[PDB]
C-alpha cells in the first residue's frame, strides 16, 4: 500500500493518458484522507468526457456520494446517489456488470442517507423495496431494525434482529447487535454471558468488540456494597483479566485502556487513572466516556474548576440537551457560590425534562438547604434574600415530607429527610431571629437617610 | 443467491467495527502495562 502511494504520486503528476490513475488513487484513499479521494474523483469525472463525452459509470458516482456521506456534503451526496441510480438505469443491458446489484447497494447507501436526513419514511421505503426483491440481504434487514430500535427494544426491531440471525446465524454483526439490545435490560446482566457466548465459536473469535462488551457488562456489576465481601474484588480482577487479554491482542485499542483505568479507579487509584486516560485523551478526544471519567478524578481532587467545563464540553455533542447523569456527576462536591445557585439552575434544567426522579428532587432540597444555611447564620444580610430564604426552606420541607412518604428510593431509603426536618424547624427559629435583624437594618438605614437629608438641607 | 456474492464482492468495507476500538494514532500498551505492573508493585 505504501508502494501503491508512491506509484500513485509517481503517476498523478504525470499523464501518459491517465484515465483510471485517479480511480486507483482514490481506491486506496478511502482508508486514508477522504478529500484526496474527492479530488481524484473530481478530475476523474472530467477525464471521461474529453476523449469521448462518456457518462461517468455509476460506481464512481455512488462512491463519491458515499464519501460526502461522511462529509458535510449530504445534499449533493443525495444528488450523487440519484444520478447514480439513473446511470445504472442508463446501464440498460449490463447484467454482466449487474447494474441492478449496483442499484441495490446504491439504494442501500441512499436509505442510509435518508436516515441521515432522518427521512426514516423514505428509508423504510427503499429498505422494503430491496428486501422485497432481495430478502437474502441482512444489512437492510437490520438497519430497519436499528430504526425501530431508535423507537425501542421489544419492537420488530428485536425481531428483525433475531431473524437476521435466523437468515444468517453466522453473522457476527447482527449477533453482536442481539446482545446490544440486551444492554438496555441491565437486569439481564449475568444472562448476557450466554447471549455473548453463542458466537464465541473460534471462527468468529477473535471478536474484540464482543469481548470488550463482556468487559463492560462485567464492569457494570461494580460500585456495589459487596466489594468488601471480595466479590467485586474478584469482579475487578476478572475485568482486569479481560482487559489484559485485549491488551495483549491489541495494544492500540482505546476502549480497553478506558476499561483498565475505570477498574483501577474503582480500585481507588485516581492519581493512577488520569495518566492512563490522558493517553486515550490524545489518542482521540471524541470518546464521550473519557470526558466524564477525567472529571470524576478532578472532583476527587475537588478540582471543580477543571471538571465542570469539561462536563459541558461533553455537552457539546448533538445528543441530548439535558443528559441526566452528567449533571449528576457535575453536582458532586460543588461548594462555591456558582457551585450552589447555578448548581440549582442545572438541577432545574434536569428536573424540567426529568421531574420523575426522587433523587433529583432530594438534591434540589439539599442545595436549597445549603443556600438557606448560607444566608441566615453569620448573616447579617439583605432583607429580600432572607425573605426568599423562608419560602425556599418551606419548599424544601415540602419535598422532605413528600419524598419520605414515597417508598422506593435509589436502593437507599431517604428517611434522612427527617433530620433535615429538625434542621429546617430550627432554621425557622433562626429565621424568626434574623428577620428582626432585617427590620433593624431597615430602621437604621431610614435614620441614616434622615441624617443625610438634614445635612443636605444645611448645604 | 447470486445477488449476495454479486454485491459483497464488488463493494468494499473501509470502516468496520474493530478498528473503531483501535486508535488511529499509535498508542502502545507497554506504558499501560508498565503502570499495570507498577500498581502491582504497590500490591
Amino acid at each position: 500500500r505504501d508502494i501503491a502511494k508512491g506509484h500513485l504520486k509517481k503517476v498523478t503528476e504525470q499523464y501518459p493518458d491517465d484515465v483510471e490513475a485517479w480511480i486507483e488513487l482514490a481506491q486506496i484513499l478511502e482508508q486514508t484522507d477522504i478529500q484526496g479521494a474527492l479530488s481524484a474523483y473530481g478530475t476523474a469525472t472530467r477525464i471521461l468526457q474529453e476523449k469521448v463525452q462518456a457518462d461517468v459509470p455509476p460506481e464512481i458516482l455512488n462512491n463519491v456520494g458515499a464519501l460526502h456521506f461522511r462529509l458535510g456534503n449530504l445534499g449533493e451526496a443525495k444528488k450523487y446517489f440519484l444520478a447514480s441510480l439513473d446511470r445504472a438505469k442508463a446501464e440498460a443491458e449490463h447484467d454482466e456488470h449487474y447494474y441492478n446489484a449496483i442499484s441495490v447497494t446504491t439504494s442501500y447507501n441512499l436509505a442510509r442517507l435518508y436516515e441521515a436526513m432522518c427521512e426514516f419514511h423514505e428509508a423504510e421505503k427503499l429498505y422494503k423495496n430491496i428486501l422485497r426483491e432481495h430478502p437474502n440481504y441482512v444489512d437492510c434487514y437490520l438497519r430497519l431494525g436499528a430504526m425501530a430500535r431508535d423507537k425501542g427494544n421489544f419492537y420488530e426491531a428485536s425481531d428483525w434482529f433475531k431473524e437476521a440471525l435466523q437468515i444468517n446465524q453466522d453473522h457476527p454483526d447482527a449477533w453482536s447487535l442481539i446482545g446490544n439490545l440486551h444492554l438496555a435490560k441491565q437486569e439481564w446482566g449475568p444472562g448476557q454471558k450466554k447471549f455473548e457466548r453463542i458466537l464465541k465459536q473460534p471462527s468468529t473469535q477473535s471478536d474484540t468488540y464482543s469481548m470488550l462488551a463482556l468487559g463492560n457488562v462485567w464492569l457494570q456489576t461494580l460500585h456495589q456494597p459487596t466489594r468488601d465481601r471480595e466479590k467485586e474484588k474478584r469482579h475487578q480482577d476478572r475485568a482486569l483479566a479481560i482487559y489484559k487479554q485485549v491488551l495483549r491482542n491489541d495494544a492500540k485499542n482505546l476502549y480497553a485502556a478506558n476499561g483498565i483505568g475505570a477498574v483501577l479507579a474503582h480500585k481507588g487509584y485516581f492519581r493512577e487513572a488520569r495518566d492512563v486516560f490522558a493517553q486515550v485523551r490524545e489518542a482521540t478526544a471524541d470518546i464521550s466516556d473519557v470526558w466524564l471519567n477525567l472529571a470524576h478524578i478532578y472532583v476527587e481532587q475537588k478540582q471543580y474548576i477543571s471538571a465542570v467545563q469539561m462536563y459541558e464540553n461533553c455537552l457539546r455533542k448533538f445528543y441530548k440537551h439535558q443528559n441526566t447523569e452528567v449533571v449528576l456527576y457535575l453536582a458532586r462536591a460543588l461548594f462555591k457560590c456558582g457551585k450552589l445557585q447555578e448548581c440549582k439552575q442545572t438541577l432545574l434544567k434536569a428536573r424540567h425534562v426529568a421531574p420523575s426522579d426522587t433523587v433529583l428532587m432530594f438534591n434540589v432540597a439539599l442545595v436549597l438547604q445549603r443556600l438557606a444555611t448560607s444566608v441566615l447564620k453569620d448573616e447579617k444580610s439583605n432583607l429580600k434574600e432572607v425573605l426568599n430564604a423562608v419560602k425556599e426552606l418551606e419548599l424544601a420541607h415540602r419535598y422532605f415530607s413528600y419524598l419520605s412518604k414515597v417508598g422506593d428510593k435509589m436502593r437507599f431509603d431517604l428517611a434522612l429527610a427527617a433530620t433535615e426536618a429538625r434542621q429546617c424547624s430550627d432554621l425557622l427559629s433562626q429565621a424568626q431571629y434574623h428577620v428582626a435583624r432585617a427590620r433593624k437594618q431597615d430602621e437604621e438605614e431610614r435614620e441614616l437617610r434622615a441624617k443625610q437629608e438634614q445635612e443636605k438641607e444645611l448645604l | 443467491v447470486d445477488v449476495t456474492r454479486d454485491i459483497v464482492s464488488r463493494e468494499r468495507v473501509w470502516r468496520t467495527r474493530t478498528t473503531i476500538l483501535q486508535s488511529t494514532g499509535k498508542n502502545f500498551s507497554k506504558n499501560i502495562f508498565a503502570i499495570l505492573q507498577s500498581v502491582k508493585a504497590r500490591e
Binding site: 462512491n63 447507501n109 453482536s176 468488540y209 438534591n363 | 473501509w14 473503531i20
Partner: peptide
C-alpha cells in the same frame, strides 16, 4: 453540608455501534 451530594458514582464505559459506512464499489 454535613455530607456531600449523593450519587451512584460509576466509571462507566460505552461502546460505539456498528458504523455501516456507505459501500464502495
Amino acid at each position: 453540608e454535613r455530607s456531600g451530594v449523593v450519587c451512584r458514582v460509576k466509571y462507566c464505559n460505552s461502546l460505539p455501534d456498528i458504523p455501516f459506512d456507505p459501500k464502495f464499489i
